[PDB]
Amino acid sequence: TAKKFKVVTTFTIIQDIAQNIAGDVAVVESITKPGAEIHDYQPTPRDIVKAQSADLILWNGMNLERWFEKFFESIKDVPSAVVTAGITPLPIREGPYSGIANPHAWMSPSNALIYIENIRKALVEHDPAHAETYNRNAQAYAEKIKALDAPLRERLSRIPAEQRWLVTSEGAFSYLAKDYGFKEVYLWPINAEQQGIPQQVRHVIDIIRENKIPVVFSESTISDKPAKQVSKETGAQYGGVLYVDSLSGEKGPVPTYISLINMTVDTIAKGFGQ
Ligand SMILES: [Zn+2]
């Protein structure tokens, strides 16, 4: 066991999934730090250093990292793999990014199984000496992710179908909303320039009042102020922050992808009174 294979990912969700497949034979690090906004991140010379010292770079694609392709042109002789191949996208519904793929595919546990398979294939391709370890680790982790779906689905099924309205800040939850049958309301369709402008707030306030939606949420990498404004003006409670674009730190309450899905579903369910 000389030097461990080095994997660099664009953001923290992929870091944790890949580290579970890598186990003990590779070290996986994320370019972005926990809590950092990932869509419009501005890479630094230090990020270039980290990616250039890697043996493999993983990214989401599907229009998530607006910075990645320009950044990756600075990197020489390091293979890359997009980890969303074979996932059917949901289009963004409005705004300047309307009609392109919504990038947040990992919020569906069923899609996470495809993430796992793509990361496994990339590790086996570029570090074939450890293929048996990657294959064994991916099979074990896929078992855990597959078993995750049923209790989450049952928990959210307790909310009456007509009341399944998921009101968030970024429209980052479209794939979870599809899996578990939620209608989707948001202050902006994808992180970008305008987040919480008028027009956006007014529309969301209208749907909340018409449908008596009981709760609204923010997310961990963006400002909670628009969501709290919406809850102040309506009958909805502020349900707290959901985790989608980033894990917490390792010593925080959302250290893993499994903990992210669990925490987000639990926070939604609590917002609806379980
Ligand atoms: Zn996002």
From Swiss-Prot:
A GO term for molecular function: metal ion binding
Where is it mostly found? periplasm
Gene3D superfamilies, sorted: Nitrogenase molybdenum iron protein domain (3.40.50.1980)
Q: How is this protein annotated for GO cellular component? A: periplasmic space
Q: Name one GO biological process term.
A: cell adhesion
Q: Name one Pfam family in it.
A: ZnuA
Q: What InterPro entries does its record include?
A: AdhesinB (IPR006129), Bact_metal-bind_prot9 (IPR050492), Lipoprotein_PsaA-like (IPR006128), ZnuA-like (IPR006127)
Q: Where in the cell is it found?
A: Periplasm
This protein's assembly is summarised as: Monomer.
The record's comment on protein family reads: Belongs to the bacterial solute-binding protein 9 family.
Entry remark concerning the domains of this protein? There is a second metal binding site (site 2) involving Glu-125 and His-126 which can bind Mn(2+) or Zn(2+). It is unclear what its physiological function is but may participate in protein-protein interactions with other metal- binding proteins.
What's the name of the protein?
Answer: Iron-binding protein YfeA
